[PDB]
Amino acid sequence: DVNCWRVYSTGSNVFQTRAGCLIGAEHVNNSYECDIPIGAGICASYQTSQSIIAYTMSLGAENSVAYSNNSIAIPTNFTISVTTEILPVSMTKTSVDCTMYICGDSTECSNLLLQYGSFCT
Amino acid sequence: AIPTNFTISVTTEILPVSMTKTSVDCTMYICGDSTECSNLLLQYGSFCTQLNRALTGIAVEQDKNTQEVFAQVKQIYKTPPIKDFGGFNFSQILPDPSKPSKRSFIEDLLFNKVTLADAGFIKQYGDCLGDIAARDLICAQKFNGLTVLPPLLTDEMIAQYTSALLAGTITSGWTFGAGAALQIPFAMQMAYRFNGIGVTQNVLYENQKLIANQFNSAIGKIQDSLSSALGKLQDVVNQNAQALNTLVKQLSSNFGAISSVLNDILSRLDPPEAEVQIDRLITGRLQSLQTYVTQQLIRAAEIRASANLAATKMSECVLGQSKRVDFCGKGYHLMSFPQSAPHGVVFLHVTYVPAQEKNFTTAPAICHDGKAHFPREGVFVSNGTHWFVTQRNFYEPQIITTDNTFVSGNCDVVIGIVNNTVYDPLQPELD
Amino acid sequence: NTLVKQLSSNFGAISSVLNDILSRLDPPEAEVQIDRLITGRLQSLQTYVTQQLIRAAEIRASANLAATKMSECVLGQSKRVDFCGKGYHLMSFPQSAPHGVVFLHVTYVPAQEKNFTTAPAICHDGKAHFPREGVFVSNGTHWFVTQRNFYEPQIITTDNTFVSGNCDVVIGIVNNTVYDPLQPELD
Ligand SMILES: *[C@@H]1O[C@H](CO)[C@@H](O[C@@H]2O[C@H](CO)[C@@H](O)[C@H](O)[C@H]2NC(C)=O)[C@H](O)[C@H]1NC(C)=O
Ligand SMILES: *[C@@H]1O[C@H](CO)[C@@H](O[C@@H]2O[C@H](CO)[C@@H](O)[C@H](O)[C@H]2NC(C)=O)[C@H](O)[C@H]1NC(C)=O
Ligand SMILES: *[C@@H]1O[C@H](CO)[C@@H](O[C@@H]2O[C@H](CO)[C@@H](O)[C@H](O)[C@H]2NC(C)=O)[C@H](O)[C@H]1NC(C)=O
Ligand SMILES: *[C@@H]1O[C@H](CO)[C@@H](O[C@@H]2O[C@H](CO)[C@@H](O)[C@H](O)[C@H]2NC(C)=O)[C@H](O)[C@H]1NC(C)=O
Ligand SMILES: *[C@@H]1O[C@H](CO)[C@@H](O[C@@H]2O[C@H](CO)[C@@H](O)[C@H](O)[C@H]2NC(C)=O)[C@H](O)[C@H]1NC(C)=O
Ligand SMILES: *[C@@H]1O[C@H](CO)[C@@H](O[C@@H]2O[C@H](CO)[C@@H](O)[C@H](O)[C@H]2NC(C)=O)[C@H](O)[C@H]1NC(C)=O
Ligand SMILES: *[C@@H]1O[C@H](CO)[C@@H](O[C@@H]2O[C@H](CO)[C@@H](O)[C@H](O)[C@H]2NC(C)=O)[C@H](O)[C@H]1NC(C)=O
Ligand SMILES: *[C@@H]1O[C@H](CO)[C@@H](O[C@@H]2O[C@H](CO)[C@@H](O)[C@H](O)[C@H]2NC(C)=O)[C@H](O)[C@H]1NC(C)=O
Ligand SMILES: *[C@@H]1O[C@H](CO)[C@@H](O)[C@H](O)[C@H]1NC(C)=O
Ligand SMILES: *[C@@H]1O[C@H](CO)[C@@H](O)[C@H](O)[C@H]1NC(C)=O
Ligand SMILES: *[C@@H]1O[C@H](CO)[C@@H](O)[C@H](O)[C@H]1NC(C)=O
Ligand SMILES: *[C@@H]1O[C@H](CO)[C@@H](O)[C@H](O)[C@H]1NC(C)=O
Ligand SMILES: *[C@@H]1O[C@H](CO)[C@@H](O)[C@H](O)[C@H]1NC(C)=O
Structure with a gap:
C-alpha cells in the first residue's frame, strides 16, 4: 500500500509494481518463467555477484x-x-x-x- | 420421422x-x-x-485453478492477417487491435457487467485520513488487519491465453491439442466435424453459404443479448465482500464484558480487573476469525470443483469434438470458443439442431430373391409408392443397390420384411 | 503435532498445567481455572475434527477421479481429449504408490509434417466426387487421396470416393480423372 515514505528502510533498487513498492530487487527487461510469484504478473528470482531480480513473467x-x-x-x-x-x-x-x-x-x-x-x- | x-x-x-x-x-x-x-x-x-496457514493454502489454490483452466498450451499462436475462413466471420470474438486492452468485443461487454468491489490494490494511508475512514468500507477493513491480495495473472495475460486458444482452433482444428498445429482450410475442418455427428460432407459443401449465414446471425444474437446475465460471477464477489464486512461489524459485541471497546476498559480499570474483561473479548474475537476461516475453506472447495469442471470443458469442447450428450451444449456438438470473464470463463458452444421433420413408412429389411437385405449405414423409407434408403439425420433419398446394402439369410425370420427390387449396378455394364 | 503443542495454552487461567493448579488451590477455586482449560481444549479438538472433514472431502473427490481413470483408461480405450495423457490414447498401466496410484499412459503422437495443396472435391464428368474416409492432396503435379493422420498416398478410384451432384455448387472443386477400376477388366 505504498506508491514510491512508510517503509522500514529505503536502500536502493526501489521499483513500483501494481502489487506495491518493491525494495531490494533489481529490475530486468527480460521475461523468464515464474520462479517466485510476486503478483500482478511480476515474479522474482535469485540470479547472477548473486542478486534478487524482478521481472515480468x-x-x-x-x-x-x-x-x-x-x-x-x-x-x-x-x-x-x-x-x-x-x-x-x-x-x-x-x-x-x-x-x-x-x-x-x-x-x-x-x-x-x-x-x-x-x-x- | x-x-x-x-x-x-x-x-x-x-x-x-x-x-x-x-x-x-x-x-x-x-x-x-x-x-x-x-x-x-x-x-x-x-x-x-494456524488460521494464516489455512488462508495461504486457499490463496495459492486460486492461482493453481486459473493456471489449470487457461494455461494448457504454451505456444502463443497469432491469428493470420488474411481472414478467409469460407464466409465465417469471427471478428466479434477475435481481439480488437486498437483498444488498450487487447480484448475482443464480447470480452469487453462481459467485463462491464460484473462490478468488482474495489478496482486496484494500492490504497494509500494518506488517501483515507480522517473523515474518509469508517465511511469507505475498504479503509474500514484495512484499519482492522483485513487485506485482499492481487492475483498472479493479470486480465491482459488471460486475454492473451484465450486469443491463442482461439487462433489455434480456427487455423488447425483439433491437431494443436495433440501435438504440433497442422493447418487445414476452415471449411474442410467443418466438413470433418459434420462427419463426426453422422452427416456426410456433401451436405456441408452444398449448404456452405446457408451455414455461414446462420452462424453469423447467431453470433449477432449473442452480442445483442449481452448489451441489454452473469449472476454466477457476481455472487462470488458479493459473498467475499459480505464476509469481510460481517467481520468488521462483529467488533461491537461485548461477549459478556462491560464494553466492546478496549480503551474504555483500560481507563477506569486496573490491570488485574481489566484482564478478565480483556480475556472475554479475546476469546470472542478469536472465535469470529475461526468462523470466517472455516466458511472460506468450504467455499474454496466448491470453487475448486467448478474449476475442475471448467478445465475438463476446455479440454473436451474446445480442443476436440465431444460425443457425450449435453456436455458441450444442447444438440450435436460442433465446436466451442472460450472467452475470459472476471473470475471466470464463458463458453460459446456451436451445435447442430435438426429442423424440419417429415413422416415416412419404414421397414427393417428388403426381400428380393429369397434373400434379406439390410442397410449398411442408413434406413429404408417409403414416400408412399417407392422405396429408398437414406441417412438417419438428414433426408437424402437414394436407390437401393447392392453396393448400398448387405445380404444375410432368407426372408422367413425377420418380423416386418417387405418385398422390393435391388438394382445391382453391374448387369447393364456387362451387357 | 499442532494438537500436541496447543497443550501449553493458559486460555486465561493461572497456568496450563492441571497438577500445578490442583496443588495450591482448593476445589471451589480450582474449578473455575479447570473450567477455562476444559473449554479451551474442547475447542482445539473441535477445530482439528473440522479440518479433517474438509480434507477428507478433497481426498474423496480425488479417489473418485482415480476410479474413473481406472475404468476408462486401463479397462478400455478413451476418446475424450486429455483424460488419459497428451496425444491419442492407446493404453494405460497402473502402479500402486503409498497412499495413491500412478498411471503410465501410452499415447500416439504425430511426428513429421509435410505441406500439400488440397481440394474438397474432384470434377470428372460433370459429377462431384468426395472422399469416403480420407482427404484429397497434391504433391504439386499429381492428385491422390490419403488418410488424415498418416501419409499413405493412393490413386483416386470409384471404389475410393462417392458421387453427389454436379460441379456447379462446391466452392473449390478441381478437375481430375477417376480411374474406375473395372474398364480394363471388361476389355
Ligand atoms: C503511483 O502514482 C503515480 C503518480 O501519480 C501514478 O502515475 C499516474 O497514473 C495515472 C493513472 O492513469 C496517470 O493518469 C498519470 O499520468 C500517471 N502519472 C505519472 C507521472 O506516471 C501511478 O498510477 C501510481 N501507481 C499505481 C500502481 O497505481
Ligand atoms: C464481420 O462482422 C463485422 C461486425 O459484425 C462487420 O463489420 C461491420 O460492418 C458494417 C457494415 O456492414 C459496419 O457498419 C460496422 O461498423 C462494422 N463493424 C465493425 C466493428 O467493424 C464486418 O463487415 C463483417 N465482415 C467482414 C468481412 O469483416
Ligand atoms: C432451410 O432453412 C433455411 C433457414 O433456416 C431456409 O432459408 C430461408 O429461406 C427463406 C425462404 O425460403 C428466406 O426468406 C430466408 O431468408 C432464408 N434464410 C436464410 C438464412 O437464408 C432454407 O430455405 C431452408 N431450405 C429448405 C429446403 O427448406
Ligand atoms: C415417390 O417418389 C417417386 C420416385 O421419385 C415419384 O415418382 C416420380 O414422380 C415424378 C413427378 O411426377 C416423375 O417425374 C418421376 O418420373 C417419377 N419417378 C418414377 C420412378 O415413377 C412419386 O411421385 C412419389 N410419390 C409420392 C406419393 O409422392
Ligand atoms: C413377397 O414375395 C413372396 C414370394 O416372392 C410372397 O410369398 C408368397 O406369397 C404368395 C401369395 O401371398 C403365397 O401363395 C406363397 O405361398 C408365398 N410363398 C412363396 C411363393 O414361397 C410374399 O407373400 C410376398 N409378400 C407380400 C406380397 O407382402
Ligand atoms: C521414423 O522415426 C524413427 C524414429 O522415431 C526413425 O528411426 C530412426 O532412424 C534413424 C536414421 O534414419 C536411426 O539413426 C535411429 O536409430 C532410428 N530410431 C529407431 C528407434 O529405430 C525412422 O527412420 C523414421 N522413418 C521415416 C520414414 O522417417
Ligand atoms: C508427384 O508424384 C508423381 C507420381 O508418383 C511423381 O511422378 C513419378 O515420378 C517418379 C520419379 O521420377 C517416376 O518414376 C514415376 O513414373 C512418376 N509417375 C508418373 C505417373 O509420372 C512426381 O515426380 C511427383 N512430383 C513432384 C513434384 O514431386
Ligand atoms: C474443368 O473442366 C470444365 C469442363 O470440363 C471447365 O469448364 C469450362 O471451361 C472452359 C474454359 O475455362 C469454358 O470456356 C467453358 O464454358 C467451361 N464450361 C463448360 C465447358 O461447361 C472448367 O473451367 C475446368 N476447370 C479448370 C480448368 O480449372
Ligand atoms: C529497459 O527498457 C527501457 C525502455 O525500453 C529502457 O529505458 C531501459 O534502460 C531498459 N533497461 C535495460 C537494463 O536495458
Ligand atoms: C406425422 O404423422 C402424425 C400422425 O397423425 C402427425 O400427428 C404428425 O403431425 C406428422 N408429422 C409431420 C411432421 O407431418
Ligand atoms: C405392425 O402392426 C400391424 C398391426 O397394426 C401388424 O399387422 C404388423 O405385422 C406389424 N409389423 C411389425 C413389423 O411388427
Ligand atoms: C509449410 O509451408 C509454410 C509456408 O511458408 C512454411 O512456413 C512451413 O514451414 C511449411 N511446413 C513444412 C513442414 O515444411
Ligand atoms: C482461395 O483463395 C483464392 C485467392 O487467394 C481464391 O481465388 C480461391 O477461389 C480460394 N479458394 C476457395 C476454395 O475459396
Missing part, C-alpha cells in the same frame, strides 16, 4: 500458423510416448481419547468433564 | 474459476494498538499461525 513461445485456403499438413512419422500421472487415494486414519487429552490422569478433571460427554461422542 | 433442414445454434455457459485472496493480521484485529492486549494475546499465538 513470460507466457510461452510465440509461433504463427501458415494458414491458406488450399493447404494442409499431414504427418509422415509417429512417436510413441509414455507419461505418468499421480493421484492421492487415501489419508491417515486417526482416533482420539478425549479424556486422555483434556484431563490426563486427574480424577477431579474427569468428574468435571462428565458434563461435556456428548461433545466427545 | 426424418429431418429435412437444420439449424446452427450458439449458446453460452458461465463458470466461476477463482475467488478473492485474503489475509488477516490477527493482532491488528483483536487488539488494535493496545500493548497490554498484545501481551495478553501472546498466550494464543498458535491459533493465529
Whole structure:
C-alpha cells in the first residue's frame, strides 16, 4: 500500500509494481518463467555477484500458423510416448481419547468433564 | 420421422474459476494498538499461525485453478492477417487491435457487467485520513488487519491465453491439442466435424453459404443479448465482500464484558480487573476469525470443483469434438470458443439442431430373391409408392443397390420384411 | 503435532498445567481455572475434527477421479481429449504408490509434417466426387487421396470416393480423372 515514505528502510533498487513498492530487487527487461510469484504478473528470482531480480513473467513461445485456403499438413512419422500421472487415494486414519487429552490422569478433571460427554461422542 | 433442414445454434455457459485472496493480521484485529492486549494475546499465538496457514493454502489454490483452466498450451499462436475462413466471420470474438486492452468485443461487454468491489490494490494511508475512514468500507477493513491480495495473472495475460486458444482452433482444428498445429482450410475442418455427428460432407459443401449465414446471425444474437446475465460471477464477489464486512461489524459485541471497546476498559480499570474483561473479548474475537476461516475453506472447495469442471470443458469442447450428450451444449456438438470473464470463463458452444421433420413408412429389411437385405449405414423409407434408403439425420433419398446394402439369410425370420427390387449396378455394364 | 503443542495454552487461567493448579488451590477455586482449560481444549479438538472433514472431502473427490481413470483408461480405450495423457490414447498401466496410484499412459503422437495443396472435391464428368474416409492432396503435379493422420498416398478410384451432384455448387472443386477400376477388366 505504498506508491514510491512508510517503509522500514529505503536502500536502493526501489521499483513500483501494481502489487506495491518493491525494495531490494533489481529490475530486468527480460521475461523468464515464474520462479517466485510476486503478483500482478511480476515474479522474482535469485540470479547472477548473486542478486534478487524482478521481472515480468513470460507466457510461452510465440509461433504463427501458415494458414491458406488450399493447404494442409499431414504427418509422415509417429512417436510413441509414455507419461505418468499421480493421484492421492487415501489419508491417515486417526482416533482420539478425549479424556486422555483434556484431563490426563486427574480424577477431579474427569468428574468435571462428565458434563461435556456428548461433545466427545 | 426424418429431418429435412437444420439449424446452427450458439449458446453460452458461465463458470466461476477463482475467488478473492485474503489475509488477516490477527493482532491488528483483536487488539488494535493496545500493548497490554498484545501481551495478553501472546498466550494464543498458535491459533493465529494456524488460521494464516489455512488462508495461504486457499490463496495459492486460486492461482493453481486459473493456471489449470487457461494455461494448457504454451505456444502463443497469432491469428493470420488474411481472414478467409469460407464466409465465417469471427471478428466479434477475435481481439480488437486498437483498444488498450487487447480484448475482443464480447470480452469487453462481459467485463462491464460484473462490478468488482474495489478496482486496484494500492490504497494509500494518506488517501483515507480522517473523515474518509469508517465511511469507505475498504479503509474500514484495512484499519482492522483485513487485506485482499492481487492475483498472479493479470486480465491482459488471460486475454492473451484465450486469443491463442482461439487462433489455434480456427487455423488447425483439433491437431494443436495433440501435438504440433497442422493447418487445414476452415471449411474442410467443418466438413470433418459434420462427419463426426453422422452427416456426410456433401451436405456441408452444398449448404456452405446457408451455414455461414446462420452462424453469423447467431453470433449477432449473442452480442445483442449481452448489451441489454452473469449472476454466477457476481455472487462470488458479493459473498467475499459480505464476509469481510460481517467481520468488521462483529467488533461491537461485548461477549459478556462491560464494553466492546478496549480503551474504555483500560481507563477506569486496573490491570488485574481489566484482564478478565480483556480475556472475554479475546476469546470472542478469536472465535469470529475461526468462523470466517472455516466458511472460506468450504467455499474454496466448491470453487475448486467448478474449476475442475471448467478445465475438463476446455479440454473436451474446445480442443476436440465431444460425443457425450449435453456436455458441450444442447444438440450435436460442433465446436466451442472460450472467452475470459472476471473470475471466470464463458463458453460459446456451436451445435447442430435438426429442423424440419417429415413422416415416412419404414421397414427393417428388403426381400428380393429369397434373400434379406439390410442397410449398411442408413434406413429404408417409403414416400408412399417407392422405396429408398437414406441417412438417419438428414433426408437424402437414394436407390437401393447392392453396393448400398448387405445380404444375410432368407426372408422367413425377420418380423416386418417387405418385398422390393435391388438394382445391382453391374448387369447393364456387362451387357 | 499442532494438537500436541496447543497443550501449553493458559486460555486465561493461572497456568496450563492441571497438577500445578490442583496443588495450591482448593476445589471451589480450582474449578473455575479447570473450567477455562476444559473449554479451551474442547475447542482445539473441535477445530482439528473440522479440518479433517474438509480434507477428507478433497481426498474423496480425488479417489473418485482415480476410479474413473481406472475404468476408462486401463479397462478400455478413451476418446475424450486429455483424460488419459497428451496425444491419442492407446493404453494405460497402473502402479500402486503409498497412499495413491500412478498411471503410465501410452499415447500416439504425430511426428513429421509435410505441406500439400488440397481440394474438397474432384470434377470428372460433370459429377462431384468426395472422399469416403480420407482427404484429397497434391504433391504439386499429381492428385491422390490419403488418410488424415498418416501419409499413405493412393490413386483416386470409384471404389475410393462417392458421387453427389454436379460441379456447379462446391466452392473449390478441381478437375481430375477417376480411374474406375473395372474398364480394363471388361476389355
Ligand atoms: C503511483 O502514482 C503515480 C503518480 O501519480 C501514478 O502515475 C499516474 O497514473 C495515472 C493513472 O492513469 C496517470 O493518469 C498519470 O499520468 C500517471 N502519472 C505519472 C507521472 O506516471 C501511478 O498510477 C501510481 N501507481 C499505481 C500502481 O497505481
Ligand atoms: C521414423 O522415426 C524413427 C524414429 O522415431 C526413425 O528411426 C530412426 O532412424 C534413424 C536414421 O534414419 C536411426 O539413426 C535411429 O536409430 C532410428 N530410431 C529407431 C528407434 O529405430 C525412422 O527412420 C523414421 N522413418 C521415416 C520414414 O522417417
Ligand atoms: C432451410 O432453412 C433455411 C433457414 O433456416 C431456409 O432459408 C430461408 O429461406 C427463406 C425462404 O425460403 C428466406 O426468406 C430466408 O431468408 C432464408 N434464410 C436464410 C438464412 O437464408 C432454407 O430455405 C431452408 N431450405 C429448405 C429446403 O427448406
Ligand atoms: C464481420 O462482422 C463485422 C461486425 O459484425 C462487420 O463489420 C461491420 O460492418 C458494417 C457494415 O456492414 C459496419 O457498419 C460496422 O461498423 C462494422 N463493424 C465493425 C466493428 O467493424 C464486418 O463487415 C463483417 N465482415 C467482414 C468481412 O469483416
Ligand atoms: C415417390 O417418389 C417417386 C420416385 O421419385 C415419384 O415418382 C416420380 O414422380 C415424378 C413427378 O411426377 C416423375 O417425374 C418421376 O418420373 C417419377 N419417378 C418414377 C420412378 O415413377 C412419386 O411421385 C412419389 N410419390 C409420392 C406419393 O409422392
Ligand atoms: C413377397 O414375395 C413372396 C414370394 O416372392 C410372397 O410369398 C408368397 O406369397 C404368395 C401369395 O401371398 C403365397 O401363395 C406363397 O405361398 C408365398 N410363398 C412363396 C411363393 O414361397 C410374399 O407373400 C410376398 N409378400 C407380400 C406380397 O407382402
Ligand atoms: C508427384 O508424384 C508423381 C507420381 O508418383 C511423381 O511422378 C513419378 O515420378 C517418379 C520419379 O521420377 C517416376 O518414376 C514415376 O513414373 C512418376 N509417375 C508418373 C505417373 O509420372 C512426381 O515426380 C511427383 N512430383 C513432384 C513434384 O514431386
Ligand atoms: C474443368 O473442366 C470444365 C469442363 O470440363 C471447365 O469448364 C469450362 O471451361 C472452359 C474454359 O475455362 C469454358 O470456356 C467453358 O464454358 C467451361 N464450361 C463448360 C465447358 O461447361 C472448367 O473451367 C475446368 N476447370 C479448370 C480448368 O480449372
Ligand atoms: C529497459 O527498457 C527501457 C525502455 O525500453 C529502457 O529505458 C531501459 O534502460 C531498459 N533497461 C535495460 C537494463 O536495458
Ligand atoms: C406425422 O404423422 C402424425 C400422425 O397423425 C402427425 O400427428 C404428425 O403431425 C406428422 N408429422 C409431420 C411432421 O407431418
Ligand atoms: C405392425 O402392426 C400391424 C398391426 O397394426 C401388424 O399387422 C404388423 O405385422 C406389424 N409389423 C411389425 C413389423 O411388427
Ligand atoms: C509449410 O509451408 C509454410 C509456408 O511458408 C512454411 O512456413 C512451413 O514451414 C511449411 N511446413 C513444412 C513442414 O515444411
Ligand atoms: C482461395 O483463395 C483464392 C485467392 O487467394 C481464391 O481465388 C480461391 O477461389 C480460394 N479458394 C476457395 C476454395 O475459396
